[PDB]
Amino acid sequence: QEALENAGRLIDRQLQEDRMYPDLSELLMVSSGMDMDYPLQLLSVPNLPEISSIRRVPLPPELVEQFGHMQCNCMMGVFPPISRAWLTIDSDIFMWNYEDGGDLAYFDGLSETILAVGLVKPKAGIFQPHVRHLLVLATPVDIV
Amino acid sequence: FVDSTFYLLLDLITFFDEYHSGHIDRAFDIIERLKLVPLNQESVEERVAAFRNFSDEIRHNLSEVLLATMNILFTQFKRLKGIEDRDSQLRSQARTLITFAGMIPYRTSGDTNARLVQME
Numbered sequence: 001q002e003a004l005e006n007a008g009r010l011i012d013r014q015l016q017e018d019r020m021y022p023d024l025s026e027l028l029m030v031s032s033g034m035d036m037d038y039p040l041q042l043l044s045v046p047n048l049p050e051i052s053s054i055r056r057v058p059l060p061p062e063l064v065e066q067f068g069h070m071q072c073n074c075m076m077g078v079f080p081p082i083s084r085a086w087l088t089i090d091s092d093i094f095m096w097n098y099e100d101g102g103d104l105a106y107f108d109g110l111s112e113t114i115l116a117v118g119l120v121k122p123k124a125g126i127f128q129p130h131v132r133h134l135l136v137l138a139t140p141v142d143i144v
Numbered sequence: 145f146v147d148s149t150f151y152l153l154l155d156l157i158t159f160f161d162e163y164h165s166g167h168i169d170r171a172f173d174i175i176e177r178l179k180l181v182p183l184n185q186e187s188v189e190e191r192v193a194a195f196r197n198f199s200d201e202i203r204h205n206l207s208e209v210l211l212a213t214m215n216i217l218f219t220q221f222k223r224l225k226g227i228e229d230r231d232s233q234l235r236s237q238a239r240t241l242i243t244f245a246g247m248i249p250y251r252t253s254g255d256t257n258a259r260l261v262q263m264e
Contacts (some may be wrong), residue, residue: 055185055187058185060230060233060234060235061232061233061235062229062233062234063228063232064230064232065229065231066227066228066229066230092227092228096230099183100172100173100176100233101232101237102172102233102234103169103230104228104229104233106229107228108227
């Protein structure tokens with residue numbers, strides 16, 4: 001009867017309903033065939049388009065310049081947590097700020113070609129458990 | 145709305161405090177945060193579309209926002225001595241900014257003497 005309790009009850013009920021919402025994937029959903037709203041054309045789905053392209057950022061030329069000479073191997077990628085991008089040419093590695101681009105970091109530590117790089121979480125209990133992330137870099141000879 | 149412009153004015157002011165008194169790098173970061181000036185790509189034009197929309201108070205302030213950018217951008221990007229040096233960024237930023245300034249000079253006081261700072 002009291003409005004205040006009443007309102008609370010309504011929200012709670014609705015909250016419950018929101019939580020109950022059906023599971024995303026079920027075999028039954030598209031057992032016959034998938035419903036698709038599929039246009040070949042960009043912005044073909046006018047109102048509905050799930051994604052839009054907000055912006056394009058080119059690799060900074062300053063970064064590119066230190067990638068100019070690469071005999072052996074190239075590779076690049078984005079680190080999801082960092083919101084930074086990395087470029088590997090031969091031995092050297094660059095990390096550049098997604099948002100900035102001017103800001104870039106360079107590894108001079110590695111002597112040899114860099115086979116692979118990866119971002120990983122630290123162990124539960126080591127001296128560096130505190131650090132947010134670890135950067136693993138593998139070259140032919142060593143893993144740093 | 146009223147509060148929003150208020151915060152923007154404060155942000156711009158903190159940018160001032162740190163602009164000069166060194167802290168070149170910090171100034172760019174803050175200016176970009178303002179989301180007024182195109183740091184990204186040629187999105188400079190979107191910055192045109194969103195310009196006229198701007199409230200009267202900000203519309204007036206932009207002149208200094210530009211040129212502050214081309215300054216820090218200049219000084220920070222003093223050609224260095226003798227490795228990863230991405231000069232390219234903080235360079236593209238000037239470019240986008242200039243296109244921006246190029247598009248609205250008429251709707252600005254009339255000092256595209258960004259050019260003087262721009263070159264050397």
